[PDB]
């Protein structure tokens, strides 16, 4: 039910072991499990700002974490589709080879060679849409800065309040899941330099000696 | 062009800003003078880029310095660097270099 996550006896960051809940986090907004051991959300309006950039961070981390492995998923046995650029942390070098930036292995898709020009178009367009996000325009102006839902919600869905509560905590949990997974993505890029799916296959081959303990010697300052 | 010119001299509007604010101007409307300069300068940039299109993509213009006595040459790798272009525009106008 709703009170399982928005009641005063809601789900917490320790279950029934969160006795010293912060007073200001009463379970009104999505999440609100009380994990504020650093106490950086003491001020109310600042807590609002941190929550808004939390949901923005969460959504763009959802895009990132999902899009990490899709080219590596579509990677074939030898790689006519993509060469060394199938890996996530080698994707940018898809602009500097002799052919161009092909989306799915063919010249018919994208096929760009001016990284500076696509940089300029990206910057102008999405800086403009950030200005629309913070002020308003064609979609809406006086709506909720975090939760507008007017032109971006065409499939119904967003009409019921307990549905709002449920699938908003579904948002915050899925976003935090992608957020944590993305940290995994960057740090496995650092400590190993190997792709996620191929690391997963190497671990499922033999979990015993293949672990991060096998790379604990790599950062040793000899 | 001549038909349009005689039309605007004879039956064209006698004063422009009462019907076309985009085309009318008092000579102290400095913002709209700057707008007119912007339009004309965009036209001149378009003409220069048209010469670019001819020199690099339409296979024209004669180079006198091709071996054997010159050739009409489609220009590949033009030198656009600021050092040479500006040094070409800020040098002496005498026989030592020649300014322009």
């Amino acid at each position: 039910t709703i009170n399982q996550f928005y009641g005063p006896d809601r789900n917490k960051w320790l279950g029934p072991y969160s006795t010293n809940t912060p007073p200001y986090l009463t379970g009104e907004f999505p999440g609100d499990y009380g994990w504020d051991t650093a106490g950086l959300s003491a001020d109310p309006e600042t807590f609002k700002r941190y929550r808004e950039l939390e949901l923005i961070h969460a959504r763009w981390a959802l895009l990132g974490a999902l899009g990490m492995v899709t080219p590596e998923l579509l990677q074939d046995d030898d790689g006519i589709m993509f060469g060394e650029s199938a890996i996530w942390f080698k994707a940018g070098a898809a602009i500097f080879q002799e052919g161009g930036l092909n989306y799915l292995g063919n010249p018919s898709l994208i096929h760009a060679q001016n990284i500076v020009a696509t940089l300029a178009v990206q910057v102008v367009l999405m800086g403009l849409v950030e200005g629309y996000r913070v002020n308003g325009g064609p979609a809406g102006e006086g709506l909720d800065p975090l939760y507008p839902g007017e032109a971006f919600d065409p499939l119904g869905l967003a009409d019921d309040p307990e549905a709002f509560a449920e699938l908003k905590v579904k948002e915050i949990k899925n976003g935090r899941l992608a957020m944590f997974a993305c940290l995994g993505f960057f740090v496995q890029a650092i400590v190993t330099g190997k792709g996620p799916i191929e690391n997963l296959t190497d671990h499922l081959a033999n979990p015993a000696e293949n672990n991060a303990f096998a790379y604990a010697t790599k950062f040793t300052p000899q | 062009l001549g038909f349009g010119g005689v039309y605007h001299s004879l039956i064209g509007p006698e004063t422009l800003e009462e019907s076309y604010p985009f085309f009318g101007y008092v000579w102290k409307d400095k913002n709209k003078m700057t707008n007119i300069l912007g339009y004309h300068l965009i036209i001149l940039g378009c003409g220069a880029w048209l010469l670019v299109l001819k020199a690099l993509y339409f296979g024209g213009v004669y180079d006198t310095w091709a071996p054997g006595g010159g050739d009409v040459r489609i220009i590949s790798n033009p030198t656009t660097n600021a050092a040479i272009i500006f040094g070409y525009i800020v040098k002496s106008p005498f026989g030592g270099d020649g300014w322009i």
Partner: protein, 122 residues
Amino acid sequence: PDLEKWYGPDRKLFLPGGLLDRDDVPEYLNGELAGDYGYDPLGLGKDEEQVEKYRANELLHARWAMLAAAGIIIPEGLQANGADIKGGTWFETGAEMLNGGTLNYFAVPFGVVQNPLPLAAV
């Protein structure tokens, strides 16, 4: 916003004010339908009710031709650029499936799907 530039008694015409007087437009165009430019030189407009009757034909015609223009420019561009469209050029696309031929769908970004549908059932 800014409906006066296209609607109302004073609107954009097919000729400007110096060459076209505002009285040379026939009476049944007074600035209430979209695209009202006062360009009816022959006797096809006749009256506003017949204008409304041809409006449905004109709008569906415009939308159909808009779909036709997009579906002409896209598959031939894909064929010329390298996509396996197998008949992207628009006025030979029917000649592909006569004896045992087929078609291919390039539905971006995950296209390249071989269609086994025969022409009679299609």
